[PDB]
């Protein structure tokens, strides 16, 4: 169980390639013994300059510390096969074993064959913010939340995935972190303006973009460059200014990066069609000032997610299988 690394990949049957990841191919597979489905992140190491990827080391470090329902967990690590009597000739590879998940959220929306109801969105966000609360409580930032990293199986279970670019957070005192994190569409305004000493608020912003995306069926802030991305946020959320966000003047790029004009916030107008309680949550989550922004705990305490009983909720009619593409 705990004796990782020494069990063999022979123990699984490779069904096929799922896709490419950060440090190798990813494979769907079935365990020969338990008959259970998994994903196998292959980690090559004959190639590569500094041996076993440090990015994989980070993901291993964090996932062994995170144990939660709605967080993708690493079951074990598994190896190729190592010949008769010369480990120096042996130049195989390792495989990180994860519970298999049927869909990612980007795939489901991009098809246009699925429609999420209020009850379906309630269930997804409840689960997402529970796993995110857990991670933040254990001083971890995800730093890469987006639709492609939110996995979903056919029995309604949501899992936050891909802690490759995750990081420890110091709450008792502030410290400097890497600025360029999160894919641009889900990146918060503080990072755009150049904040290095950032908080768990960055992850809540990304989850806010997703809440909106679940109603619009399309990313709400969709642009190619930092400047354009801030322009689009400002149009909907209002231009960043001291009246709303006092400490914004302290940020490196507040004067370099500026919107066309001082836009008014009109989120409640543009998302009038969304339910009222859902709109209250979205507003709090896409608040520009990170110190005023909703925490993951607070989202669970909101009206929209307060009384969502997950065992009582029925699973959504999802597509069975993809046609491999």
């Amino acid at each position: 169980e705990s004796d990782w690394g020494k069990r063999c990949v022979d123990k699984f049957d490779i069904i096929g390639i799922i896709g490419e990841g950060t440090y190798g191919q990813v494979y769907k597979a079935k365990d020969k013994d338990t008959g259970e489905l998994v994903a196998l992140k292959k980690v090559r190491l004959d190639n590569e300059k500094e041996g076993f990827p440090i990015t994989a080391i980070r993901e291993i470090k964090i996932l062994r510390q995170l144990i939660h329902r709605s967080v993708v967990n690493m079951k074990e690590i598994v190896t190729d096969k190592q010949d008769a009597l010369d480990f120096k000739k042996d130049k195989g590879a390792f495989y990180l074993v994860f519970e298999y998940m049927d869909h990612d959220l980007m795939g489901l929306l991009e098809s246009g064959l699925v429609h999420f109801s209020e009850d379906h969105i309630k269930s997804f966000m409840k689960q997402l913010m529970e796993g995110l609360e857990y991670c933040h409580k254990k001083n971890f930032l995800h730093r890469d939340i987006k639709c492609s990293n939110i996995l979903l199986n056919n029995s309604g279970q949501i899992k936050l995935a891909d802690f490759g670019l995750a990081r420890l957070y110091n709450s008792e005192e502030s410290r400097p972190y890497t600025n360029k994190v999160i894919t641009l569409w889900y990146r918060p305004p503080e990072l755009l303006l150049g904040e290095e000493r950032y908080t768990p608020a960055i992850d809540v912003w990304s989850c806010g973009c997703i809440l909106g995306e679940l109603f619009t069926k399309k990313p709400i802030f969709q642009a190619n460059l930092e400047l354009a991305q801030l322009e689009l946020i400002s149009r909907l959320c209002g231009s960043p200014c001291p009246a709303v966000w006092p400490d914004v003047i302290k940020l490196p790029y507040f004067n370099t990066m500026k919107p066309k004009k001082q836009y008014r916030r009109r989120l409640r107008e543009e998302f009038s069609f969304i339910p009222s309680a859902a709109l209250d949550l979205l507003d709090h989550m896409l608040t520009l000032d990170p110190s005023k922004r909703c925490t993951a705990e607070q989202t669970l305490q909101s009206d929209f997610l307060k009384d969502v009983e997950l065992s009582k909720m029925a699973p959504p009619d999802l597509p069975h299988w993809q046609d491999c593409h």
Partner: protein
């Protein structure tokens, strides 16, 4: 979930090297030499004390599953440091570890690395990871030495002397198998105990309960005095016929 990394005195006498006929005094020396190698190489590359300590823990653990007669000390030391840099976010190029290893080691010692030193280290990493069961996260005594010392209240020069002595004894402990015997919290408390005794300091007078002789019970739970005495004796054994001299 997570594996057990602690062995008895009996289990530490039956290591893979002992089973292959290596006497305990020689294994002790190989462990001393290999730890200091990791320590000296990483210090020349300007690495954090936790990096060095993580390297040394991997090294001590490695040789509970493998024999020194099959895996040369210094290659493993180099491999353990290389992985530790990556785990502790202070990475170095393997190239540079070999370079620094060459400057410190003589020609017979460096012979262990063979024709292609880098390749010998890179190859071994696969086995290192398997051996440590991908349990990369390790805590050391230093952080606990600091945490417990910040909570003491008294003469700042004497307390500083305690912490400085204690710090040296943590470094010394990493030469031994103490990290395989006791948790880092306990070893932290033990080095404070050791320094206090040598300095003729009564540490209880710096605590929240000045009267009570077992000052350590507010930091570490359920640890008898005999355990701390045994840790001290193992650390002091390093100065006995080793011809080292202890601080201040």
């Amino acid at each position: 979930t997570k594996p057990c990394w602690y062995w008895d005195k009996k289990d530490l006498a039956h290591t893979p090297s002992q089973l292959e006929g290596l006497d305990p005094a020689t294994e002790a020396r190989y462990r001393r030499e290999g730890a200091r190698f990791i320590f000296d190489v990483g210090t020349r590359l300007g690495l954090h004390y936790d990096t060095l300590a993580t390297g040394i823990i991997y090294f001590h653990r490695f040789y509970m599953f493998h024999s020194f007669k099959q895996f040369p000390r210094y290659v493993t030391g180099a491999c353990c440091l290389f992985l530790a840099g990556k785990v502790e976010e202070t990475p170095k190029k393997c190239k540079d570890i070999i370079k620094t290893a060459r400057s410190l080691l003589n020609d017979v010692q460096f012979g262990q690395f063979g024709d292609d030193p880098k390749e010998e280290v890179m190859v071994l990493e696969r086995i290192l990871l398997q051996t440590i069961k991908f349990d990369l996260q390790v805590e050391h005594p230093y952080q606990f030495l600091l945490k417990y010392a910040k909570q003491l209240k008294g003469d700042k020069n004497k307390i500083q002397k305690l912490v400085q002595m204690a710090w040296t004894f943590v470094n010394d402990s990493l030469c031994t198998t103490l990290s395989l015997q006791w948790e880092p919290e306990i070893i932290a408390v033990a080095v404070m105990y050791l320094a206090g005794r040598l300095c003729k300091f009564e540490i209880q007078e710096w605590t929240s309960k000045p009267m009570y002789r077992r000052w350590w019970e507010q930091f570490v739970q359920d640890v008898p005095v005999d355990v701390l005495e045994d840790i001290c004796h193992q650390i002091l054994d390093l100065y006995s016929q080793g011809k080292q001299q202890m601080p201040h």
